[PDB]
Amino acid sequence: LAGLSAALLRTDSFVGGRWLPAAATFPVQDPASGAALGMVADCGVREARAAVRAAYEAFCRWREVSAKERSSLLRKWYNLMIQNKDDLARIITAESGKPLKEAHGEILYSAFFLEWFSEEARRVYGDIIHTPAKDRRALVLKQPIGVAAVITPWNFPSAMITRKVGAALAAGCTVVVKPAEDTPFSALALAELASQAGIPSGVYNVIPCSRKNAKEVGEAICTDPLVSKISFTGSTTTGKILLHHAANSVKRVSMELGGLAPFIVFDSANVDQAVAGAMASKFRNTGQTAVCSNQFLVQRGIHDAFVKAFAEAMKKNLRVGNGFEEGTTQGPLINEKAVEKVEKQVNDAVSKGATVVTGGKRHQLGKNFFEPTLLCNVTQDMLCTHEETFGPLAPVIKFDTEEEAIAIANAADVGLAGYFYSQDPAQIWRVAEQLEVGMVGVNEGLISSVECPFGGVKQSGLGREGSKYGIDEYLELKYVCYGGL
Amino acid sequence: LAGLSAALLRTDSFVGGRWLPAAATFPVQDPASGAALGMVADCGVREARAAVRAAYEAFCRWREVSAKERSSLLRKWYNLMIQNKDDLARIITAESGKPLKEAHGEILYSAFFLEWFSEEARRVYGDIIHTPAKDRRALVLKQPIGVAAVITPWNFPSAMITRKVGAALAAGCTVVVKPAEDTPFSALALAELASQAGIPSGVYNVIPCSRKNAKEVGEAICTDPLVSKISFTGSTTTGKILLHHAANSVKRVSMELGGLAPFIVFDSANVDQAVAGAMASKFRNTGQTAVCSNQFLVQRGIHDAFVKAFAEAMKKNLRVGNGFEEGTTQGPLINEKAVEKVEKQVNDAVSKGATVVTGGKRHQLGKNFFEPTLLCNVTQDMLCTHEETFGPLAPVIKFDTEEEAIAIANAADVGLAGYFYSQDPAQIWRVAEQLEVGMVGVNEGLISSVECPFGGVKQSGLGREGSKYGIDEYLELKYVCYGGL
Amino acid sequence: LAGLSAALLRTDSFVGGRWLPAAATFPVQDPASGAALGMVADCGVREARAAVRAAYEAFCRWREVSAK
Amino acid sequence: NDAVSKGATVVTGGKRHQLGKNFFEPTLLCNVTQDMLCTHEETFGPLAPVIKFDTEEEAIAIANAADVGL
Ligand SMILES: Nc1ncnc2c1ncn2[C@@H]1O[C@H](COP(=O)(O)OP(=O)(O)O)[C@@H](O)[C@H]1O
Ligand SMILES: Nc1ncnc2c1ncn2[C@@H]1O[C@H](COP(=O)(O)OP(=O)(O)O)[C@@H](O)[C@H]1O
Incomplete structure (x- = not known):
């Protein structure tokens, strides 16, 4: 204090x-x-x-x-x-x-x-x-x-x-x-x-x-x-x-x-790494930043393995509490209206197909604390009016091809930051150049500098x-x- | 044709x-x-x-x-x-x-x-x-x-x-x-x-x-x-x-x-040159350009010699006529409203002290032709609502000091081009850096490039x-x- | 019908000794047969003011011409 | 889009044709439902939504749905 x-x-x-x-x-x-x-x-x-x-x-x-x-x-x-x-x-x-x-x-x-x-x-x-x-x-x-x-x-x-x-x-x-x-x-x-x-x-x-x-x-x-x-x-x-x-x-x-911020994980990605990056990029500042990866586009092949590892990392590392408290990795949301936006985004999604893997409700610490949430089986159309909803929420949208992943990412007429994990030399250049965004993270979730x-x-x-x-x-x-x- | x-x-x-x-x-x-x-x-x-x-x-x-x-x-x-x-x-x-x-x-x-x-x-x-x-x-x-x-x-x-x-x-x-x-x-x-x-x-x-x-x-x-x-x-x-x-x-x-465009002539300037530059910069395209020197700030010492040489150059070189006609250096004004603005600026000035040295009325060729005009004994306040009046008109404002000349030039909250003639190495740097303008012409009236x-x-x-x-x-x-x- | 003298049948306005077309045009039809006669310039306030100036300037010279 | 983002599954086509301008790829979507045909009752284009049905009474009930019959 x-x-x-x-x-x-x-x-x-x-x-x-x-x-x-x-x-x-x-x-x-x-x-x-x-x-x-x-x-x-x-x-x-x-x-x-x-x-x-x-x-x-x-x-x-x-x-x-x-x-x-x-x-x-x-x-x-x-x-x-x-x-x-x-x-x-x-x-x-x-x-x-x-x-x-x-x-x-x-x-x-x-x-x-x-x-x-x-x-x-x-x-x-x-x-x-x-x-x-x-x-x-x-x-x-x-x-x-x-x-x-x-x-x-x-x-x-x-x-x-x-x-x-x-x-x-x-x-x-x-x-x-x-x-x-x-x-x-x-x-x-x-x-x-x-x-x-x-x-x-x-x-x-x-x-x-x-x-x-x-x-x-x-x-x-x-x-x-x-x-x-x-x-x-x-x-x-x-x-x-x-x-x-x-x-x-x-x-x-x-x-x-x-803006938004896609986090595309391809089949050639190193899962543990993709997850570590997904962790750092989405929950830093409790998901309240303009570079916080909102939509996760994970490829069919690696999907299930990813979503399961991601959530297991959320349990092992995210500890909601007071910022000054030792061992805390998740602080509160700036204010009430903010918590209301997350809840809003979570319900609207679930009531449209989305499946909650973890979190989902306000954290039982009360006030402005929300449980880190991971929803999968999410679709594109579930991101409206929420393009500016910062919170510890990670919607996972499955995709088939790279042309598809890119098409979805570039969807928004907004382009700030973008991330993607891959072990393909050529794919790395294609996506990095095609992502109509101002900053691209390649196999890294924290690009500050x-x-x-x-x-x-x-x-x-x-x-x-x-x-x-x-x-x-x-x-x-x-x-x-x-x-x- | x-x-x-x-x-x-x-x-x-x-x-x-x-x-x-x-x-x-x-x-x-x-x-x-x-x-x-x-x-x-x-x-x-x-x-x-x-x-x-x-x-x-x-x-x-x-x-x-x-x-x-x-x-x-x-x-x-x-x-x-x-x-x-x-x-x-x-x-x-x-x-x-x-x-x-x-x-x-x-x-x-x-x-x-x-x-x-x-x-x-x-x-x-x-x-x-x-x-x-x-x-x-x-x-x-x-x-x-x-x-x-x-x-x-x-x-x-x-x-x-x-x-x-x-x-x-x-x-x-x-x-x-x-x-x-x-x-x-x-x-x-x-x-x-x-x-x-x-x-x-x-x-x-x-x-x-x-x-x-x-x-x-x-x-x-x-x-x-x-x-x-x-x-x-x-x-x-x-x-x-x-x-x-x-x-x-x-x-x-x-x-x-x-914007406007000051053309400051200091006592250390080479008159013939200053005039040649004043000629080229003010009457190119019959004074209809955003880089056309509008206000001439000429220093007391060199003033009279300048104004007299300037006008004598206007008689010897400006030949109003049809663009395709051989020997023409002055074309017509784009349209009627334009001619009206020059007349406006000329009268408002004269009826406020200004002294017409040459030109001053519509050219007796009729239509949109105006006589190249040179007025001296002009004051700052005679440039209002006319900051965007392009025409073959040159108002000469006398000044005493360099701090003064600069103060007047930077008057406008507009700064595009600026010109000045001087033979003082140090004065050239001072003015060039102080003229809050985007382009500066030093001893030159045509800076295109x-x-x-x-x-x-x-x-x-x-x-x-x-x-x-x-x-x-x-x-x-x-x-x-x-x-x- | 046709067969006239190209020069006599005109479609442009005449201002300052020149044939000038306007931005728009209006149709003129034979009131008896209904046939299209031609598309004539449809001058607006701008063309008019221009024509006035042309006349005002011509006047200053015309008034000077001898009566004979 | 409205369809796909409501269940529909694109079998072929789906986007503008890569010839640009006003060319669209012949599209065939299946797994479509009735409610996905609103405000689009007057949308003419190379698009074919396939709605599965069980019985004839059902098929007829859906067809006669619209208060329009040409
Ligand atoms: N209409 C406005 N005019 C000027 N500054 C504004 C206005 N609205 C918000 N701000 C300021 O902008 C900053 C944050 O912008 P804002 O759009 O409120 O983003 P957020 O709430 O997501 O941080 C704050 O310093 C805030 O006071
Ligand atoms: N409101 C406007 N919106 C868009 N273009 C305009 C508008 N007004 C003028 N223009 C265009 O801007 C150009 C010239 O700008 P303008 O301000 O009229 O300067 P000037 O008449 O001094 O050349 C022309 O191409 C003209 O059609």
Whole structure:
């Protein structure tokens, strides 16, 4: 529970290098025990506009700072995260409910993003191009966009912020962060460290706010003429709303929208491995992530052997309980409406053919705990209105051929992540290239990596985060025609 | 006038490798003489949806074609353009009204884009990234987005299409082109050559339509779920409308929106050169382009000498007349409403201080011809609602300091192109980096180049066309985590 | 019926000394036999405003021409 | 699709023909049930749904189902 570091756990918003409370506040409770965590400032349109101005003014100075200097600050920020990793992780588990171990995993990952972009800052290179004309030279400079509005989800209350903000700052931009009301603390803990690190005032701003204020606040920062860019990770519905906001001022946009995620297991797959991957990919964060494999397409031949091994792994490894409790691998669902969606998806399925192999009802721990569920004999049509239902539920759809498996996977007009196990060299290339998805896992169920491009195709998003391509979402190209020669 | 090549001048739409007429047709007239050029198909929402399907189906096959093959087809298309350059140019002058010489310039430029991207097709490279995990390898593939909706203006009826389409095809995408009603012929002449070149059916589609059908048609193709990308060049107003269209399906977008364009002449500038540049940049296409320097910021010291030399160059070189007429450097304005905007801008200015140095009224040739006008003693506030008034008008605003000149230039929340003449090494870098614009001309007034990145910052656009960055607007990154090692 | 003089029987509008077709056309039929006579340009507000301008500009020169 | 996703079993055909455009593969589905013919009483295409029956009284009862008889 408590015992943290007074400085890391914050309740006020962070604007212009100062902790500022709002007129109102919203409650944040531990999703597992229900305990009150704290009263967080609930910023409104005014606080937002103020935060934007703070960022816009910081930008004009920040863009001037040398890259080697911005790199150094990003690294100091990284080091501070590592030094305080245990507390930072307790905060994640306290508000997201994910197991302490999974929180430790996020903090490292989150830290690695600041570290990674710290290294990118000094590597923004312009070009020198040859043109026919002998009286001129072509130079191409890359410069930061300006101020960016950053809006993140509760899933990875730390990493989701750090992967955008690190790139933003690396390029020379300032940011205004609007964290999820379920998990605002992680965003503010970062702010505390950003000041300890020496990040100049106004570069990193955080404006927490409740569901009520979300619509109004989001509209303010995504509309402000002082904001030139928008970075968002969440549901498609919200994404489209922001894209409309951006459209009025032609703002640069980048986002990731929670799509499905097929997990195709072919006959040539190593079962134990397929299962291990199925385990890791589906039950991490209790199945509450946009990369959590939802539909399992298992081939006839290997089907039965798979489904039986999968379930036996669920019994041997999934221990539902409180995130801080030792030996827990399954935390609670973020809230009630969430539990309602799983139940909904489970019943609708069963009452349409589906066969429950394990789990199936709320866990007898009560509250927001649900039993890890594995249903087989599932069909495609049983995945409607549930394309955005995150929970520890794994529907297994049997398939015959590879053309079929691929046809089903590419069904959705959404494509984020995709997984598949196979021992066929050629099949691996065919499927990997044909899966209209942004990220493909081959014989692996956990593909996280700060040095690789994340994002989706079609309606799953725009742009990419992480890797050598992330910083591009925050730069503008300027062709300079040096003539008169 | 006539005498062209029956095959190059077309009146039907081009869909699926076939010339198809619509239920209705719209007239196209020579903007100079008023002569009837022809009756062009006026496609509606039905023809559009049909063209999209044709493209979507062609895509599934086209994406499969080798890059070396797509490169070869793009080059054959290029060669065909060169072989038919004289006719292709007559067509541009016939519908846009720009001088035959300027049309010859566009055809080469237009051809060079197909040539340039032909070379890019074989150079789309993926990456291999090192990650800590020893049991996995990271691969990054680049694949075409799918079908792209392309909407172009009348200014460069050929080049505007060719710079987007060449990249689109280079990446492996198919396209559906909706040309400007003022200049549809150039788009269809290209289609004729694309079939001669052997471009597979459905890869390049053209759906002409009148003002009436513009709204409906644009909405159809920019909304169709079979279209994954949108490329547009035109006014900001239309751009925002399309961005809203795209927002509903999270479509990839890229566009260029007609901003202003400062032309700052400093005291250290070589007058004759500054003037030569001012001439070329302002009166090319009779001042009807988004890169046409509108406001001239000339420094006190060199002011008077400049304004006097500028005007004397206007008398010695600008000869208003019919584009096909020999010795013509000024064609007509696209239409009546256009002439009305210039007059409007000229009067509003004069009746607010401005002093007319030359020109000022409609040219006594009648119709859509306007006298090249040069007004000095102009002030900033005299540029409202006229930020999108293209015409042979040059308002000269005097300035004192460089901080001032820059402050005024960056005034607009629009930044496309910018120019400035100076002989100060350090001043050149300061201004070039500070001009919040997408392209900067240093001691040069004509910066066109297929191998350099075109586009704008802020509200002037999204993405870039041409150069090594153009093809990026049509690809999607796919991170492939090869695990199980 | 036919056999006239190609030049005398016209289907396009006449503006500014040029024969110009409109986006649409309307049918003209012999009121006695019902036979199709031809498809005539169907000018709209745009063609009209254009014709007015053509006339207004011609006027400024025409008024100058001697009466003789 | 509505059929398959309700029990129907595709014996042949089933998707658009790979000739593209308006060409569809001749399709034969068996294991079809009555209720899978709604809003499709006016869907003309190369599709043949096979509904198994036991008795003649039954066959006739199903055939005369529709309030349409051509
Ligand atoms: N209309 C909206 N405008 C702006 N931000 C919004 C809006 N709706 C939700 N958000 C914000 O988006 C983030 C999460 O997006 P949301 O679509 O609610 O996904 P989820 O609940 O699945 O995490 C949160 O920070 C939330 O406050
Ligand atoms: N509402 C609209 N929807 C789709 N396309 C449009 C719309 N308005 C104009 N266009 C198209 O955009 C192109 C030119 O854009 P426009 O904003 O009219 O610029 P301009 O007239 O300055 O060239 C033309 O091809 C035109 O038909």
